[PDB]
Design a binder for this molecule. Structure first.
Ligand SMILES: Oc1cccccc1=S
Ligand SMILES: [Zn+2]
Length: 257
């Protein structure tokens, strides 16, 4: 099955998931000089005051912080979006080294990691239906650079010992995702896809310009997680990122000059 290794990594995924070579795949390089400022783009509305986190899961490819999405509690709207998108989970992609790990790049620059806050369009009722629609998901992408610690990340880092291996979960209530956001909500936006199989082309990407800083110790702890199950040979969960894919017939828009 798919993964991030030599024999089952991103260069292989097209054999089981032919959409890997499609017309609106993600991630992409964000060429900041080529992105066009769109003064009609609205400010992003991030409404996380009532977010209800539930659980954290190691799925064998990343860890997901899951939310109660059975009511409009943590929603994204505005920006390039029409309508209301509910937060279902967040996750990260990260490197073996601080010089790599992000999926999106900025003028070819790679960040140490990238946080994806996954939201689904409430006009489609559930996440599973939404992923079959070209406007089904909105993913807020935030870059991580190594420097000062992010205090609001530390509760995540502290639980990772309890979900070291594939299939482990832990209760993870009362986590406030507002503590992972940078100051500015200036963004880039384009149409694309999930970055893991099944690579469905259902995502409006919203990539914040301003990274967050995390400490070297925080991202070190991400790198101690395992892709394997308990009792299987240890394979560190590192370099779980897809490289940039061809832009094809797409324009990246900027909310800012
Ligand atoms: O990595 C992902 C995993 C699962 C669902 C939706 C979006 C992304 S980027
Ligand atoms: Zn992702």
């Amino acid at each position: 099955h798919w993964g991030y290794g030599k024999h089952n990594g991103p260069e292989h995924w097209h054999k089981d998931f032919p959409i890997a070579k499609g017309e609106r795949q993600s991630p992409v390089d964000i060429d900041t000089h080529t992105a066009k400022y769109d003064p009609s783009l609205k400010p992003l509305s991030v409404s996380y005051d009532q977010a209800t986190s539930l659980r954290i899961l190691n799925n064998g490819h990343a860890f997901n912080v899951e939310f109660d999405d059975s009511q409009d509690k943590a929603v994204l709207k505005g920006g390039p979006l029409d309508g209301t998108y509910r937060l279902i989970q967040f996750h990260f992609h990260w490197g073996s080294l601080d010089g790599q790990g992000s999926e999106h790049t900025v003028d070819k620059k790679k960040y140490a990691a990238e946080l994806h806050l996954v939201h689904w369009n409430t006009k489609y009722g559930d996440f599973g239906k939404a992923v079959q629609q070209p406007d089904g998901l909105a993913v807020l992408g935030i870059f991580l650079k190594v420097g000062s610690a992010k205090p609001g990340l530390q509760k995540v880092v502290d639980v990772l010992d309890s979900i070291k291996t594939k299939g482990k979960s832990a209760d993870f209530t009362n986590f406030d995702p507002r503590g992972l956001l940078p100051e500015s909500l200036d963004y880039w936006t384009y149409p694309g896809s999930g970055t893991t199989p099944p690579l469905l082309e259902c995502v409006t990407w919203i990539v914040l310009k301003e990274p967050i800083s995390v400490s070297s110790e925080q991202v070190l702890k991400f790198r101690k997680l395992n892709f394997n199950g308990e009792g299987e040979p240890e394979e560190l969960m590192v370099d779980n990122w897809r490289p940039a894919q061809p832009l094809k017939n797409r324009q990246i828009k900027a909310s800012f000059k």
